[PDB]
Amino acid sequence: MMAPVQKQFREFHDRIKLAQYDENQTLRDERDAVLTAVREGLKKVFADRGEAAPTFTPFNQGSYAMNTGVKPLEGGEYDIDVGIILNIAKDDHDPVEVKKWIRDALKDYGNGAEIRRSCVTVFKPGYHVDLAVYADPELSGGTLCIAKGKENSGDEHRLWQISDPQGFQDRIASKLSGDDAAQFRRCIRYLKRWRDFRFSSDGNAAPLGIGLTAAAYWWFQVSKRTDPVSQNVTYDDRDALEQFVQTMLDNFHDTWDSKDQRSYPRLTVELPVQPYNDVFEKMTGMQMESFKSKLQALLNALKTAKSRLELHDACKALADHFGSEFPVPEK
Numbered sequence: 001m002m003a004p005v006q007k008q009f010r011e012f013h014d015r016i017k018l019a020q021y022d023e024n025q026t027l028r029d030e031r032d033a034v035l036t037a038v039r040e041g042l043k044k045v046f047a048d049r050g051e052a053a054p055t056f057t058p059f060n061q062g063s064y065a066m067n068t069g070v071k072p073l074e075g076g077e078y079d080i081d082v083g084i085i086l087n088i089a090k091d092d093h094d095p096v097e098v099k100k101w102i103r104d105a106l107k108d109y110g111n112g113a114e115i116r117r118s119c120v121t122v123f124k125p126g127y128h129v130d131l132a133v134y135a136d137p138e139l140s141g142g143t144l145c146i147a148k149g150k151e152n153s154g155d156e157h158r159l160w161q162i163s164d165p166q167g168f169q170d171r172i173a174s175k176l177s178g179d180d181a182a183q184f185r186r187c188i189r190y191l192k193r194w195r196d197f198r199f200s201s202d203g204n205a206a207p208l209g210i211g212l213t214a215a216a217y218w219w220f221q222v223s224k225r226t227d228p229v230s231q232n233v234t235y236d237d238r239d240a241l242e243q244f245v246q247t248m249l250d251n252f253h254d255t256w257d258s259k260d261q262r263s264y265p266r267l268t269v270e271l272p273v274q275p276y277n278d279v280f281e282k283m284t285g286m287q288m289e290s291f292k293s294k295l296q297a298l299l300n301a302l303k304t305a306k307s308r309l310e311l312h313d314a315c316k317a318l319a320d321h322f323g324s325e326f327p328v329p330e331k
């Protein structure tokens with residue numbers, strides 16, 4: 001038989017999922033509009049260089065490429081992630097210089113464009129496009145490097161960093177297959193909506209979607225049951241989330257801070273590809289403590305939802321952490 005609240009989890013997922021690039025013409029059209037804008041802008045930017053603009057190869061990045069995207073809450077923005085590999089040698093150019101090429105290309109597009117430590121972001125009514133900027137591996141020693149650093153960053157934090165976004169995307173796509181991979185992606189989405197619902201008071205404190213995605217890569221485990229008579233398989237998203245959240249909580253470690261003279265709980269989640277960085281490294285110790293506490297509250301609700309006699313009460317317990325799209329059947 002079907003798991004206790006599985007129907008409501010699937011309805012919740014139906015309500016929060018955003019179709020990936022290959023299934024979403026609106027996202028493809030917005031992405032391609034930005035790409036055309038950067039092509040024409042590069043024409044204009046290199047008009048005063050005496051040379052044709054360098055060409056680039058675009059590729060899908062992020063959750064819309066990995067089929068892990070969620071709809072924003074009301075008032076939020078879509079996040080269109082794309083990479084562009086410019087036909088340039090990384091040692092011949094400064095990373096901030098190349099990102100400034102791209103930013104000046106998009107200077108008069110939409111609400112504007114700005115250079116961020118890891119990308120150039122252009123803004124548009126209801127969504128922003130994050131263009132990660134890379135040098136050509138053929139001209140840069142065979143390595144794919146992203147342009148890191150901003151004008152304010154200075155000198156030490158400005159570099160071409162080895163990067164592997166397509167390797168990461170392959171890792172997320174390949175960890176599981178079929179309906180197992182479906183449950184994996186559903187649980188990443190559930191946690192992204194939890195993030196949006198319970199970290200809205202301080203968006204800087206929120207655990208990034210990339211962090212939750214990498215954590216799922218390391219620690220998600222499928223939860224399913226095979227009927228001993230029909231061999232019919234049913235998935236148990238509530239149990240899968242309970243195991244995954246418990247494993248995340250188990251991987252927090254108290255971490256001394258000499259300035260504050262105390263420990264904070266920290267979850268370290270290495271990217272499984274280059275540059276193998278802790279995707280949570282920017283979160284402060286206090287933000288980590290709050291993250292852990294809300295994770296524990298979510299885990300407690302997942303456990304409570306297993307024991308409620310009334311489906312209404314189990315679903316309400318979950319809605320308290322997942323927000324208004326989680327169905328709560330009447331009692």
Ligand SMILES: Nc1ncnc2c1ncn2[C@@H]1O[C@H](COP(=O)(O)OP(=O)(O)OP(=O)(O)O)[C@@H](O)[C@H]1O
Binds near residue numbers: 061168271278
């Ligand atoms: N801190 C990071 N470390 C390594 N790679 C990152 C990091 N942040 C972003 N990336 C790369 O850029 C992509 C887009 O980042 P983003 O923060 O939009 O995550 P996402 O997977 O699109 O999740 P979301 O649905 O929350 O946007 C990621 O999939 C990842 O490949």
Ligand SMILES: O=c1ccn([C@@H]2O[C@H](COP(=O)(O)OP(=O)(O)OP(=O)(O)O)[C@@H](O)[C@H]2O)c(=O)[nH]1
Binds near residue numbers: 062
């Ligand atoms: O390795 C990376 C990192 C980041 N990105 C892309 O750049 C976007 C911004 O990445 P962040 O949200 O981590 O901010 P930042 O590193 O650019 O630093 P600040 O300017 O905010 O101080 C991310 O959402 C992602 O799409 C990559 O493509 N690859």
Ligand SMILES: [Mg+2]
Binds near residue numbers: 063081
């Ligand atoms: Mg994204």
Ligand SMILES: [Mg+2]
Binds near residue numbers: 079
């Ligand atoms: Mg982004």
